[PDB]
Amino acid sequence: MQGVNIYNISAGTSVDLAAPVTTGDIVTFFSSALNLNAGAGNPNNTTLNLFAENGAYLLQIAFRLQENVIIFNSRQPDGPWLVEQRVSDVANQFAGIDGKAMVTVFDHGDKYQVVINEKTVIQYTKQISGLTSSLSYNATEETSIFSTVVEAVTYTGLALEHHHHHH
Amino acid sequence: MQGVNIYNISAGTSVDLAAPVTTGDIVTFFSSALNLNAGAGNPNNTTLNLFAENGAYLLQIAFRLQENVIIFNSRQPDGPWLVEQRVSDVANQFAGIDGKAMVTVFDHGDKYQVVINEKTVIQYTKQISGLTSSLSYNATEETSIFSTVVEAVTYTGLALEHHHHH
Ligand SMILES: OC[C@H]1O[C@@H](O[C@H]2[C@H](O)[C@@H](O)[C@H](O)O[C@@H]2CO)[C@H](O)[C@@H](O)[C@H]1O
């Protein structure tokens, strides 16, 4: 059945989900601040990650102000970072809303749709499949583009399909 | 296409959705405050409403501190309120989180599942069916349990049509 779980993630920490995020599920990270002028990343200012039980980075959303880009990538816990998908102009993706923001990730089975506020910035074809068992928000107090603590809200058990058969 | 929409709603106003909420979709109201000591409503302290395209009150979630109850109901805009569904102990529903709150409504087609924070408060069997085309948040400045402005986020286009060819 459908359920809502709330997690308050401090910068530099991660949490295990009470209910895994799977195909048809949604997770939204809410930030109470938007620091588009934060310190220089190294090279990341902020990273939002969806982890598989084996620690694989199912999806990482990395924000880089200096390089002015949002990187989407995946990799096994002991494997190399895979093919990066980039979105230029970090500020433009958040335009329209200041002092706060939200990043939503839809798990569509074959792809991860990421939406910054109301704007879909990418339909990311998965490079690694599997259910998300933990989330993380990594950054330092001085260079994060988001608030010290980011609230993650997962909407699980959502999957709804209408099967139409033909022959 | 699945999509997220954000609407800031001031107490006593309503908003027209850019994308309607239908079966399988979600709408969550976020409050930057929680005032469970706001006093008696008139009779409601706060009401969250989902309106169908034809103007009907698909669902009203009404909080009453003096009655210590949450009332769920429906009605036609020119008609009488229908059969009230009640859930007692308002505080218990928001237990665990202070200074803020979220109310989530899942549209399951035949029923609306209301969730306060992480707790499912009710599986409301619909008295009126249809797609939600607008929302409203009514309350006064002094007696609302939520912040002056509530932020509603909709997740739409979620149901999927899966064709199989044999
Ligand atoms: O791909 C995510 C991953 O990127 C690393 O930095 C990459 C850099 O983006 C790429 O252009 C370069 O060729 O290789 C670097 C890694 O050696 C980040 O260091 C890492 O934290 C992730 O963000």
Ligand SMILES: OC[C@H]1O[C@@H](O[C@H]2[C@H](O)[C@@H](O)[C@H](O)O[C@@H]2CO)[C@H](O)[C@@H](O)[C@H]1O
């Ligand atoms: O049902 C929501 C609706 O309730 C109205 O008040 C009701 C009251 O709760 C009920 O016990 C009584 O029998 O009828 C009243 C209506 O005549 C509120 O006035 C209305 O705003 C909604 O909150």
